[PDB]
């Protein structure tokens, strides 16, 4: 037995962009999941197929902690059955998701005066992601009938766009750090 390295995930200094969402694969370790839920740091703590307090009493093999940054009004999309740019083109949960979605405001860390543009999301994609699919390609998106030939222009858009995180953004446009815990149930 040994405690899960959840500190490395939740307390990581830098977070991935949502299109290149980071995944941490952890063996069947032990963790006081009840203490996580009762942490005031977490403003979003939503579990599906299982209760936060009964997480330790689960039969699974690997737990995955996926984590990334999105904007506040996009946290609603990190849930089974959702549509929109994030759920369709960046990070998709399955309908039968078993696990938890944890999120918190990171304006004090991921916003910069004059804008922090390091965080990106996929704005254009021909089709929806399958659940737990990751797409990091950067091919020019062809929105018209003429081929782009790797040159941006009219009807030829780079498929990723930067968030513009400023401290004075409204809360729907402030950065949120998200961790998704899923369980390979037996």
């Amino acid at each position: 037995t040994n405690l899960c390295p959840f500190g490395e995930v939740f307390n990581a200094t830098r977070f991935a962009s949502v299109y290149a969402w980071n995944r941490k694969r952890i063996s069947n370790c032990v963790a006081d999941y009840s203490v996580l839920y009762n942490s005031a740091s977490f403003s979003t703590f939503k579990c599906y197929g299982v209760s936060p307090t009964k997480l330790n009493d689960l039969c699974f093999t690997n737990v995955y902690a996926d984590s990334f940054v999105i904007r506040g009004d996009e946290v609603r999309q990190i849930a089974p059955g959702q549509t929109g740019k994030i759920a369709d083109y960046n990070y998709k949960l399955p309908d039968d998701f078993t696990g938890c979605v944890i999120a918190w405001n990171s304006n004090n860390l991921d916003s910069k005066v004059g804008g922090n543009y390091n965080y990106r999301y996929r704005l254009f994609r021909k089709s929806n992601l399958k659940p737990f699919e990751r797409d990091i390609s950067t091919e020019i998106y062809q929105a018209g009938s003429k081929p782009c030939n790797g040159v941006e222009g009219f009807n030829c858009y780079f498929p990723l766009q930067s968030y513009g995180f400023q401290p004075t953004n409204g809360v729907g446009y402030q950065p949120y750090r998200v961790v998704v815990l899923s369980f390979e149930l037996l």
């Epitope: 369709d88 929806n128 766009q161 409204g170 446009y173």
Partner: antibody
Framework: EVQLVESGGGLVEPGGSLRLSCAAS????????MHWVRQAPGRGLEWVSL???????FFAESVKGRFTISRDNSKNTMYLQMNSLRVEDTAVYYC????????????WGQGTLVTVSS | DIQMTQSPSSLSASVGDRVTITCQAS??????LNWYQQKPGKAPNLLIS???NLETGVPSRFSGSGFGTDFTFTISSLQPEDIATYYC?????????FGQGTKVEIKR
């Protein structure tokens, strides 16, 4: 040339149904954020619906459950299927292409008139 | 929904005057406000996007500014071909909503 062209609007009785088309050139309908926007006679613009390239659809509350969106990629055409039409659905209907965040609704068709009346 | 309050609902200015149109959002919409021109019987034309982008081919006498909840649309020098109804539109909050419009006539 880059163009959107709506057709299919006409006189329909209340409670009837009707299908509009939005035929594009230059723009690939199925690769774009495509909207329907309507304008009642003498009134302002009112958003109706949106379909993502990936297929996700969104609808205004006034038309939710009555309108649906179809796409025929081989005709480069988007369809708005309108059911259980009401008098207050009477308007000119436009389709429009949006390039979100980095631009606006940059192409609109000429519009097609739907008249719901007995 | 987000309500866009567009003022004035109509104005009358002479050729070459400066025209200012305001649009105020009920909630924060960051920079995602667009401006359109519509002549009677015609489809709207995109003039400004993202609060201040001068869109392709649009004459430089049109401009926009603002961020958050208060936005402004300017015609620096009103021209006879500018007789139209102008609309703001917030684009990035579902459902996308429009201002009530501003009918611009010309004083002569």
């Amino acid at each position: 040339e880059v163009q959107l062209v709506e057709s299919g609007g006409g006189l329909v009785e209340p409670g009837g149904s009707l299908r509009l088309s939005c035929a594009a050139s230059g723009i690939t309908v199925s690769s774009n954020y495509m909207h329907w926007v309507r304008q009642a006679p003498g009134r302002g613009l009112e958003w109706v619906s949106l379909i993502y390239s990936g297929g996700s659809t969104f609808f205004a509350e006034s038309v939710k459950g009555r309108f649906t969106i179809s796409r025929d990629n081989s005709k480069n055409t988007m369809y708005l299927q309108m059911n259980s039409l009401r008098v207050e659905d009477t308007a000119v209907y436009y389709c429009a292409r949006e390039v979100p965040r980095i631009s606006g609704y940059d192409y609109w068709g000429q519009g097609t008139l739907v008249t719901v009346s007995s | 929904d987000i309500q866009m309050t567009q003022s004035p609902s109509s104005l009358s200015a002479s050729v070459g005057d400066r025209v200012t149109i305001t649009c105020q959002a009920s909630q924060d919409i960051n920079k995602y406000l667009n401006w359109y021109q519509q002549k009677p019987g015609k489809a709207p034309n995109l003039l400004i996007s993202g609060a201040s982008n001068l869109e392709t081919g649009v004459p430089s006498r049109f401009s926009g500014s603002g961020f958050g909840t208060d936005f402004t649309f300017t015609i620096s020098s009103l021209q006879p071909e500018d007789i139209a109804t102008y609309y703001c539109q917030q684009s990035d909050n579902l459902p996308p909503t429009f201002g009530q419009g501003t009918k611009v006539e010309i004083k002569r």
